[PDB]
């Protein structure tokens, strides 16, 4: 179906403890393929998916150089931001950056991103037109002017609409067996008596990919959103994902309840009921 590539950058200052921590990770959809850790011995971009290991030394040397440049830029940014907001030098702060592109089923460009956050809050973000910027406060305003004069948006757009999309396609092809797979969820239901008058019905979805999925409970066809416990979709660690929705059922009403599962790998939505 639809696909996307994303790079996540986190930079955390450590006052009096030297250079800031820098961590970069790349994703194709819900699969990480690369990473760089400033505190690692290698000082290189490393593969994190088997299908990227085929990339020669030129790819790794190149990516290593660019991620190092990314790193140095963020180290400076931490100082500039500490100035914008008149903050001391003893406090630890966080800068986060994310950029990437979305493509439809036809693998054609659909949407591009490039966003910054400071201490967990939106700082500056490229708008959907990839031509304008969003700045909430004065600090961000300054940055916006700077980036407007250096025509940053125009260059970022070239990457997001061109390079980003092109290489996203390349990764999809090179890693077809895993990146282009759709694993329908394995579903089952558990039943446990919490007391004499009640029991827990839990609907399971396992070993599915991608991560996007919908799990709901119904009682006689009526949604139970606020009476069902929904856990966050979670990684199994093997590249697949998990999720469950539980509902407390009064003993004797099992038949009234239905679990509904929607996922890319399912032709039609599944309906399950304890019986």
């Amino acid at each position: 179906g639809s696909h996307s590539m994303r790079y996540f950058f986190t930079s955390v200052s450590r006052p009096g403890r030297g250079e800031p921590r820098f961590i970069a990770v790349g994703y194709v959809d819900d699969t990480q393929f690369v990473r760089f850790d400033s505190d690692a011995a290698s000082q290189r971009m490393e593969p994190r998916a088997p299908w990227i290991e085929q990339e020669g030394p030129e790819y790794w040397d190149g990516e290593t150089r660019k991620v190092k440049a990314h790193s140095q830029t963020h180290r400076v940014d931490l100082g500039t931001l500490r100035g914008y907001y008149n903050q001391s030098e003893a406090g630890s702060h966080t800068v986060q950056r994310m950029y990437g592109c979305d493509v439809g089923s036809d693998w054609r460009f659909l949407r591009g991103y490039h966003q910054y956050a400071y201490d967990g809050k939106d700082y500056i973000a490229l708008k959907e037109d990839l031509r304008s910027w969003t700045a909430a406060d004065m600090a961000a305003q300054t940055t916006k002017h700077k980036w407007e004069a250096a025509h940053v948006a125009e260059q970022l757009r070239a990457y997001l609409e061109g390079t980003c999309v092109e290489w996203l396609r390349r990764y999809l092809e090179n890693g077809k067996e895993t990146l282009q797979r759709t694993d329908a969820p394995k579903t089952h239901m558990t039943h446990h008596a919490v007391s004499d008058h009640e029991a827990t019905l839990r609907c399971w979805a396992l070993s599915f990919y991608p991560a996007e999925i919908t799990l709901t409970w119904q009682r006689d066809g009526e949604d139970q959103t606020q009476d069902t416990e929904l856990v966050e979709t979670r990684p199994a660690g093997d590249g697949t994902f998990q999720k469950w929705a539980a509902v407390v059922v009064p003993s004797g009403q099992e038949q009234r309840y239905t679990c509904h599962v929607q996922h890319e790998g399912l032709p039609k939505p599944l309906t399950l009921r304890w019986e």
Partner: peptide, 10 residues
């Protein structure tokens, strides 16, 4: 593939 253009400063 990382953005290859020199990222401008904040």
């Amino acid at each position: 593939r990382l953005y290859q253009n020199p990222t401008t400063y904040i």
